[PDB]
Design a protein around this nucleic acid. Structure first.
Ligand SMILES: [Mg+2]
Ligand SMILES: [Mg+2]
Ligand SMILES: [Mg+2]
Ligand SMILES: [Mg+2]
Ligand SMILES: [Mg+2]
Ligand SMILES: [Mg+2]
Ligand SMILES: [Mg+2]
Ligand SMILES: [Mg+2]
Ligand SMILES: [Mg+2]
Ligand SMILES: [Mg+2]
Ligand SMILES: [Mg+2]
Ligand SMILES: [Mg+2]
Ligand SMILES: [Mg+2]
Ligand SMILES: [Mg+2]
Ligand SMILES: [Mg+2]
Ligand SMILES: [Mg+2]
Ligand SMILES: [Mg+2]
Ligand SMILES: [Mg+2]
Ligand SMILES: [Mg+2]
Ligand SMILES: [Mg+2]
Ligand SMILES: [Mg+2]
Ligand SMILES: [Mg+2]
Lengths: 59, 74, 92, 53
RNA sequence: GCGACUGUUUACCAAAAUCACAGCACUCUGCCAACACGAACAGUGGACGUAUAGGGUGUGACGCCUGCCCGGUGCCGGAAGGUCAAGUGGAGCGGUGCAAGCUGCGAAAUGAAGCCCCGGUGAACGGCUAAGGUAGCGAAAUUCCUUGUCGGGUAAGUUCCGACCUGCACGAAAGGCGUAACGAUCUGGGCGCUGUCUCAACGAGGGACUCGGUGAAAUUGAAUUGGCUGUAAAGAUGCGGCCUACCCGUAGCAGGACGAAAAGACCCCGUGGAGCUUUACUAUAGUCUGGCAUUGGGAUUCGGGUUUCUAGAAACUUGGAUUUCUAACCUGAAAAAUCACUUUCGGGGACCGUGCUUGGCGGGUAGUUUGACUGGGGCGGUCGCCUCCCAAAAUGUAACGGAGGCGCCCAAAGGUCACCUCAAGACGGUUGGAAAUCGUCUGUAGAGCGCAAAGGUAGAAGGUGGCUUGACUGCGAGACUGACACGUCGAGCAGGGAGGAAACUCGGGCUUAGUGAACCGGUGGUACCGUGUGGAAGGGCCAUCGAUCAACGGAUAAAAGUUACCCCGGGGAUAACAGGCUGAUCUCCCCCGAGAGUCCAUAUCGGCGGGGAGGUUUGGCACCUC
RNA sequence: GUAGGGGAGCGUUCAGUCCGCGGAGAAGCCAUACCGGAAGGAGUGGUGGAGCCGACUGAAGUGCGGAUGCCGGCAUGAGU
RNA sequence: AACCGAACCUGGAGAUAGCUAGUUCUCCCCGAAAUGUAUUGAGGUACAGCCUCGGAUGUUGACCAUGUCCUGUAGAGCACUCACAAGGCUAAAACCUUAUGAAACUCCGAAGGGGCACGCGUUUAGUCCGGGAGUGAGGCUGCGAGAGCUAACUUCCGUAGCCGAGAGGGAAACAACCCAGACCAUCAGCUAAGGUCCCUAAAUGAUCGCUCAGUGGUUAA
RNA sequence: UGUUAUGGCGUGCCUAUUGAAGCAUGAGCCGGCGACUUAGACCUGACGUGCGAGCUUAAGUUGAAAAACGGAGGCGGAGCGAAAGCGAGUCCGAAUAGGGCGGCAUUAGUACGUCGGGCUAGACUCGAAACCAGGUGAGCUAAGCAUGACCAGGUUGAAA
RNA sequence: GAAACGAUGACUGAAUCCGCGCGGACCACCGCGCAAGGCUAAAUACUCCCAGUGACCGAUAGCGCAUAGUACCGUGAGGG
RNA sequence: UCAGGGAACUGAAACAUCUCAGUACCUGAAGGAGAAGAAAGAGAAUUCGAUUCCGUUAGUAGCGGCGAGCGAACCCGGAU
């Protein structure tokens, strides 16, 4: 469904799923330094199986 | 009263004579119960972890002081 | 709604512009004739898709004489077309 | 991390010519006038930062 | 007792102490009236009425009367100022193009009702901190304690009448206190008379019964359908053991078949419903208000402008207030009733209405919101985070289980470097004589660590000065932990740093609490997108800002109540009745013997304690039955 | 062995193809002591008065005891 | 217009229904769940856990032994903390002798438990990827606790086992208890728990005693 | 085979459940009706067929006891990123740390069919109280209006 | 929303050929285009009716009707 | 078929914007069909050339409590 497109459910070559890290996006910061670049790359696929069902056609 | 308290964790994560890898977290402790021997580093929360690969060795002093070290495997 | 789809922190920016048709060197060299491709033969050469311009990149590495007319190509692809001799044309 | 009218504050940052944000909570309690420290900007880094704004 | 009264009402459980009522009061309305029906500047009702009229409101014959409190709310009246919408006005900022120019945004001043503000009004909502009960009444249709206390009546009077007053919570037009008469009203009492009764009897008729004619119903898993005691989902004909009992009917009885009837109406559950309510949310009829339109003229005041003879004036004048006119428009009269007409006109008149927009008011209407946990629900309490106990020598682990803490602080309590070592007692010392400051003696710490507690700490994390911004940017080998998303620890590589002579150490603080996903926006930086192209608007990326979203994985940007008029979907998942298990409390028995019994514990009596029984008490529990 | 997953199959209607049967009697209906691991299927007998098995493949309005389920018929209460 | 806190008829409309009922032909092979976390969440949804099918891997599973480490319970103990029993001593306290209590005390401290390696030895499942799920209300007993009254066919966890979804024998009857897991046939044999006087199968058995109460076959001070 | 006498054994079915012979639900009896579908060039899997580094067509056109034609388009064929862009590399950053990925030691597709699921529609069948639109009703009852009709007999005895 | 353009209810109401609208705030350039006048077969939708067909029904099916909007219910709309 | 007027249940697991949907309903006009039509256009090639219709682009570009959900057009292939 049209939300997950520009937001990352993103699919890879292996048909795996990219979300990364939410730790603090915009409001509520001012704590440490590696939490901030702690904005990440990483995901589990347990909830990928039903994830990309939303992104299915325009992956 | 109704304050359900907390989960915490602790425990000793890698036991004696276990082959660990460089970066393995060895013990989760509160203060320093187990003290860092040769091969072993200690973080903020007083966690003990491994700087190299090898057999894990426990050192006991009569309690009151303890140690964890790493004997190389190779 | 709220099961780990929202609560997930992305924006990015959507564009998805010009997309080139991939033509492997590995295809062009090795087999066939070096038929002097241009944009003509691509129809029958099993590179026929269209809708988009055509682009050449290096994949398989082999020496041959070849001359290819595409819309654009990569650096090492240029290098590999010239190293075994040849040319790659581009419009202005 | 909660914020309001109260003492201390969450303080903002800038430098001579360098454009950068440290964002360290200052404290108006004992002493706040100069928020000045040494912080390292976009390129040359290695310079003085005025967190007084 | 209640209402005064005839009356009126719940077609089908309520006729009344309800409604009405004559009488009284507040207030509204000057007449195309207020007001009401209405797509409507049509029409109509008010009313072919017009202020001893017309609407609304509350009390309720008559009699005596009706008190204190304008703080809050409403309502009227006020006016110095405070705040406020479009709008007239337009300093400035910006894009674009060579430029004239075209264009994004935009304040000061000026701008209406209203609102804060002053005052007043209670037969306005009201109340007995704005004041606190005038008369009258008071164990009342009001009184909890309560069968109040005396009295009356009765052989005996929890009711009744009378007094008193301590009025749990009477009281003056949501009227107070009385009142002759009235009442299928209501309460107590007498007389009379009686089958109401002691206590039933006899008689009649019409059904019940029998015979001939016609001949249904609700119910129905199938039945070949006993008693006791026990067991079973906890109340057995259908299980067990024991007793009983030949087959089939008729008239009768209602104990059982948890007998029939109605998917319980009580209760709880449903992110069910509907009626109502209001200072819940939101809109809106309606209504008020500024500007614009129909919509015009002249005198007169005031800001200004362009034209021109010596700071004056003439003036095409443009706007604002008053005044006034009249051809728009409204509206009445005259032979022609609604109209159209000519008129003398009459009056109103640029208002009013009406149209577009502006701000206010707006339960009159309208759509909805009104968490969960919960030994039923409610009320109380509890919702996230940290610590110990529970926790059964790994991790882990519930309860409306046992105790306490967090939502910060620290520009130094941090990085590094260097030195220092605490609590307490004994002895002896001048502001002392429990405790000061100084002194020697012991002193694995019996101290300390910003805060809770546990762990940790004597080779320091404790106490101190030196220099300082590692409270850095770019990253992360490998692991702890979680369903997920979060969370935690970390060697080492680089750019660059800080302390040390040095090995080296530092990417916040002895650690474990000091927290907020997403979305939408604010600020700085980078220049990726930028719609014919070159820009710019807007977007994107790296920082950052706004959350008692505290019901703390967070429902919308925006939300309180009531139903006994209630409706639907379900629950014996879950209260109230009864049973059931339990036996705390309840009933009862026993053991001991302290003393009372003049003397003698045990004739009787049994403190302080102890051990059982019973299942009649108030309960616990939620097991069958919603 | 309950929800749940997997495998083999039985039956009914229509359809194409194949084999066919029927007035010396079709389908249906009725009785039955046989066959088959079950869904089931034969044999003979009795009714019936027009049509119909079997094999192979295909397509389903395809299999009932319950739903206070729907229509219909007929019981109980009762010669009350 | 015989049922008005919003009439009746048609229509939107097969409104919606986290709720209740119902869900039909056969044999075969497996086989659960009522736990954890989040929830305007609590009788409901998502993810995990547990089931099945298929592919791959192919002993990595399983028990049990050896070796190695981690632990602070049972117990016990008083050395700290809180409590407390008689005495000595001396301006209450400290202190000595004697003596105890502890979930939130600990100088100590098992049995057991968990990780790892290994197979000295027996076994025979595990893991990964992919398709379809259902269950997310549990019940009883023994053991270890909290609540409660050291009450309850209570309630809330931990732990085994059974019922759940388990027939068969036993305990009269009797989900859980004892014994034992039903592929099919038989008028064949051995046993378990339980039993062996008659109602029912099987010693009115053997030896040495005890009890005279029907104790047996209603509890105590 | 039918019936029977005696013996032994023996707690209807269904649902709902921790637990049912249940004094819990349902149902008088027999017949017939009666509930997990259908649709889309959707998505994802299992099996099967055809071609296969390629595989298919859609609308339509032409024949139509018949099917052929139709390459518009779709899927493979390259990944990485916020994108510009770049490319067996791409990203973040001032080059070396990593995410994604190609190489793999090697993993081919596409079209059609049946089936296992998913999504959108009633979506297994039956069942609401309610909500909205347009109409029908005052021949019942609540009132108004216009116009008619009706109240044996007796008692009481006001103003003037 | 940065909201262009079409469309109007109210108030305003410019040019016309070196002119005029557009190209998604806006400007220049560049490019398409001539509003404020009308008409206009065919490809398209539907089935009261007629025809032909069917892995459509065959008497609880198929429309409700093997003809009936009849009987029948309702004041009626309506149902049947 | 065009037009004047214009619902709610429902969905968002509550509910206001949204969704239902310009759906249902009412109304007006008309024919066998209607509507629509002869670029102040689409659009980025200095391409195209009235309208409608089908396939397709394409669940794309986009709109959205950026929630539920909503969803084009140009090119291109055909009918005409
Ligand atoms: Mg009266
Ligand atoms: Mg009545
Ligand atoms: Mg009555
Ligand atoms: Mg009787
Ligand atoms: Mg009954
Ligand atoms: Mg019910
Ligand atoms: Mg009732
Ligand atoms: Mg480091
Ligand atoms: Mg949102
Ligand atoms: Mg919100
Ligand atoms: Mg009442
Ligand atoms: Mg009870
Ligand atoms: Mg059934
Ligand atoms: Mg009888
Ligand atoms: Mg009789
Ligand atoms: Mg009625
Ligand atoms: Mg329905
Ligand atoms: Mg399946
Ligand atoms: Mg229990
Ligand atoms: Mg069950
Ligand atoms: Mg609604
Ligand atoms: Mg909803």
């Amino acid at each position: 469904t049209h939300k997950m497109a520009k937001r990352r459910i993103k699919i890879t070559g292996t048909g795996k799923v990219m979300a990364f890290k939410s730790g603090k996006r915009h409001q509520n910061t001012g704590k440490s330094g590696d939490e901030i670049r702690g904005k990440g790359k990483g995901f589990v696929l347990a909830k990928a199986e039903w994830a990309r069902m939303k992104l299915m056609l325009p992956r | 009263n109704g304050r359900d308290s907390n989960p915490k964790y602790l425990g000793v994560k890698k036991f004696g004579g276990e082959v660990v890898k460089a970066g393995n977290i060895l013990v989760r402790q509160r203060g320093t119960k187990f003290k860092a021997g040769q091969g072993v580093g200690m973080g903020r929360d007083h966690t003990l972890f491994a700087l190299s690969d090898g057999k894990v060795v426990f050192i006991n002093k009569g309690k009151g002081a303890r140690f964890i070290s790493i004997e190389a495997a190779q | 709604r709220s099961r780990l789809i929202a609560r997930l922190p992305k924006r990015g920016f959507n564009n998805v512009g010009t997309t080139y048709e991939v033509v492997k060197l590995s295809q062009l060299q090795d087999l066939e004739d070096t038929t002097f491709d241009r944009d003509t033969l691509e129809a029958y050469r099993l590179v026929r898709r269209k809708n988009r311009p055509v682009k050449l990149l290096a994949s398989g590495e082999i020496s041959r004489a070849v001359t290819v007319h595409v819309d654009a190509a990569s650096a090492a692809a240029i290098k590999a077309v010239e190293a075994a001799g040849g040319r790659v044309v581009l419009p202005e | 991390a909660k914020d309001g009218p109260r003492i201390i504050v969450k303080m903002e940052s800038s430098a001579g010519t360098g454009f950068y944000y440290t964002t360290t909570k200052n404290r108006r309690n004992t002493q706040a006038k100069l928020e000045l420290k040494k912080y390292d900007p976009v390129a040359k880094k290695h310079v003085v930062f005025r967190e007084k704004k």
